[PDB]
Design a protein around this ligand. Structure first.
Ligand SMILES: OC[C@H]1O[C@@H]2O[C@H]3[C@H](O)[C@@H](O)[C@@H](O[C@H]4[C@H](O)[C@@H](O)[C@@H](O[C@H]5[C@H](O)[C@@H](O)[C@@H](O[C@H]6[C@H](O)[C@@H](O)[C@@H](O[C@H]7[C@H](O)[C@@H](O)[C@@H](O[C@H]8[C@H](O)[C@@H](O)[C@@H](O[C@H]1[C@H](O)[C@H]2O)O[C@@H]8CO)O[C@@H]7CO)O[C@@H]6CO)O[C@@H]5CO)O[C@@H]4CO)O[C@@H]3CO
Lengths: 284, 165
C-alpha cells in the first residue's frame, strides 16, 4: 500500500476500493496497539466534530499546521451529515498511519454502525463503492480509542462524563473491538452533555445517556486531580464554549454546520506549559 | 505543571481568521518526538466478522479460519471445515521466523451440538515463544486432510500474520 500516493491525491482538491480497505486495516492494527485511554504529552491541538466538511478540515490544517508540524487530537464525529465523509476519514486514517505517535483520533457517537447507517455515511459508501466497504469501516471504527488525558491535567472525550466512572481503570478495562451499547459507561462517554440547569444528573433530551451539572464536573476534577474537561459534541455559536467557570469546554470545528446553522469552528491550542488558546474559523 | 488560559497572562484568548497548491518537504523523523507515553496483536480482523466473505472462502476452499484471539502470549482459535469424510486431520502450520522454519500443530474436534451436519469445527491453541526478534515475521496457515485430499486456508495467499510490540 502506498500511503504517500494516497495523501497526495487527497490533498489536491478517484481512490481505489483496495486503497481505502488498506487504510482501514492498517489503522485498525495501530489503534489496537495503542491504549484505549491515551496518555498524551502537550503541545497539542484539539479539534471537535468535522462531520464530513472536508474543505473546512483542510482549512483547519492550513491554519494550525499540517502534520507533523503540529500534534493533533480529534474528539470524534468524522463522518456524517456533510458531503464528503469518505475524503475526511481517509485523510485522517492516512495521517494516523503516517505519524502514529503525533496524530490521534477518538471515537465519537457517529462512528457507530447504528448511527452512521442512518445519517449518510452508509449511503456514501453504497453509492461510490459498495456495502462491503462500509462493513470494513465499521470494524475499523470499533477499534478507535475512547478518551485521552493530556499531561495528567486535561481529560478529553467526545461526549462527557458518566455516573458510573469512579476510576480510569474502568475505561482501560473496556475491550476492543466493540459496538456501542444503548446504556452504560461507553455509551455515556460518547453521548452525555452538560446542562446549566441540572443539579447533578438528569435525563438527556436526545433519548440517549444523561446530563450532568457543574457540581459533577468540579467533584470529578477534584477526585482525579484534573484541571479541565475538553469535549466536543454539540454545535456552539462561537466554535468553543466554556462551562462551569472554565472547568469544561466544548469544541466544534465544522463551521456553518450543514448550512442549517451560522456557527464558527474552533480548535484549542495547548502549548508545552499547558497554556490554552483558541483558533477560530469564522465564515463570511 | 497546570492549565492556564491566555486571558490570565495578558495575551489574546481567541485568534479568529475569516474565510469564504501542493508543496513537498523532506523531514527527519527523529527531529520530532513522540506525543505518547508508555505486547502482541493480530494483523487481521477475525474472518467471521464479515459472514458473506467468510462463507465465500469456506465454500471455495472447504476450510476457513473462523475465530482467532490472542490470549496472553498464546494464540487460540477455531477453524471450520466441510464434512467430506468421517476421519479428518486439521493442522495449523505456523512460523516464528519468516518461514525459515515452521511447525504443524494438530487441531481438536469440538462437540458443537449446533452448527449443522455439513460442517465441523476444530479448536487450536499455540504458545508463542517467549522471545522473538523484532525483525522476524510470525505467520500461520491452515491445512485440512480428508477423503484423499488436502485443502488449505492461506488467507488468499497472505497467511494470517501476527505483529509484535
Ligand atoms: O518453505 C519455505 C516457503 O515458505 C513460505 O511458503 C509457505 C506458505 O506461505 C504457506 O502458505 C505454506 O502452505 C501451502 C500453501 O499456502 C498452499 O497454497 C499450498 O500450495 C499450493 C500452491 O498454492 C499451488 O500454487 C501449487 O504450488 C506449486 C507451484 O505452482 C510451483 O511453482 C511448484 O513450486 C515449486 C517452485 O517452482 C519453487 O519456487 C520452489 O519453492 C521454493 C520457493 O520459491 C521459496 O520461496 C521457498 O518457499 C517459501 C515461500 O516463499 C514462503 O512464502 O522454498 C521453496 C522450496 O520448495 O519449489 C517448489 C516445489 O518444491 O510446485 C508447487 C507444488 O509443489 O501447489 C501447492 C500445493 O502443492 O501448499 C503449501 C504447502 O506445501 O507453504 C509454505 C510453508 O511450507
Amino acid at each position: 500500500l502506498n500511503l504517500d500516493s494516497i495523501i497526495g491525491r487527497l490533498l489536491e482538491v478517484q481512490l481505489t476500493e483496495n486503497e481505502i480497505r488498506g487504510l482501514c486495516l492498517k489503522s485498525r492494527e495501530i489503534f489496537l496497539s495503542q491504549p484505549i485511554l491515551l496518555e498524551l504529552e502537550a503541545p497539542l491541538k484539539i479539534c471537535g466534530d468535522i462531520h464530513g466538511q472536508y474543505y473546512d478540515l483542510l482549512r483547519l490544517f492550513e491554519y494550525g499546521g499540517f502534520p507533523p508540524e503540529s500534534n493533533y487530537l480529534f474528539l470524534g464525529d468524522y463522518v456524517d451529515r456533510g458531503k464528503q465523509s469518505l475524503e475526511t476519514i481517509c485523510l485522517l486514517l492516512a495521517y494516523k498511519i503516517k505519524y502514529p505517535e503525533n496524530f490521534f483520533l477518538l471515537r465519537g457517537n457517529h462512528e457507530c454502525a447504528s448511527i452512521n447507517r442512518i445519517y449518510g455515511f452508509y449511503d456514501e459508501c453504497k453509492r461510490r463503492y459498495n456495502i462491503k466497504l462500509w462493513k470494513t469501516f465499521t470494524d475499523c471504527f470499533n477499534c478507535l480509542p475512547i478518551a485521552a488525558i493530556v499531561d495528567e491535567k486535561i481529560f478529553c472525550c467526545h461526549g462527557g462524563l458518566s455516573p458510573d466512572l469512579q476510576s480510569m481503570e474502568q475505561i482501560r478495562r473496556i475491550m476492543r473491538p466493540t459496538d456501542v451499547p444503548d446504556q452504560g459507561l461507553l455509551c455515556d462517554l460518547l453521548w452525555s452533555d452538560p446542562d446549566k440547569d441540572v443539579q447533578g444528573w438528569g435525563e438527556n433530551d436526545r433519548g440517549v445517556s444523561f446530563t450532568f451539572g457543574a457540581e459533577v464536573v468540579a467533584k470529578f476534577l477534584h477526585k482525579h486531580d484534573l484541571d479541565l474537561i475538553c469535549r466536543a459534541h454539540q454545535v456552539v455559536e462561537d466554535g468553543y464554549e466554556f462551562f462551569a467557570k472554565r472547568q469544561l469546554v466544548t469544541l466544534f470545528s465544522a463551521p456553518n454546520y450543514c448550512g442549517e446553522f451560522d456557527n464558527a469552528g474552533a480548535m484549542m491550542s495547548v502549548d508545552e506549559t499547558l497554556m490554552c488558546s483558541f483558533q477560530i474559523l469564522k465564515p463570511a | 505543571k497546570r492549565v492556564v488560559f491566555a486571558d490570565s497572562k495578558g495575551l489574546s484568548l481567541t485568534a479568529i481568521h475569516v474565510f469564504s497548491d501542493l508543496q513537498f518537504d523532506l523531514l527527519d523523523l527523529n527531529d520530532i518526538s513522540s506525543a505518547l507515553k508508555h505486547n502482541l496483536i493480530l494483523d487481521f480482523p477475525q474472518p467471521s466478522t464479515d459472514y458473506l466473505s467468510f462463507r465465500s472462502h469456506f465454500q471455495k476452499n472447504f476450510v476457513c479460519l473462523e475465530n482467532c484471539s490472542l490470549q496472553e502470549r498464546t494464540v487460540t482459535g477455531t477453524v471450520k471445515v466441510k464434512n467430506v469424510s468421517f476421519e479428518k486431520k486439521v493442522q495449523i502450520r505456523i512460523t516464528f521466523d519468516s518461514w525459515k522454519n515452521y511447525t504443524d500443530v494438530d487441531c481438536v474436534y469440538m462437540k458443537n451440538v449446533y452448527g449443522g451436519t455439513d460442517s465441523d469445527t476444530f479448536s487450536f491453541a499455540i504458545d508463542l515463544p517467549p522471545v522473538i526478534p523484532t525483525e522476524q515475521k510470525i505467520e500461520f496457515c491452515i491445512s485440512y486432510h480428508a477423503n484423499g485430499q488436502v485443502f488449505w486456508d492461506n488467507n488468499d495467499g497472505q497467511n494470517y500474520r501476527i505483529v509484535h510490540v
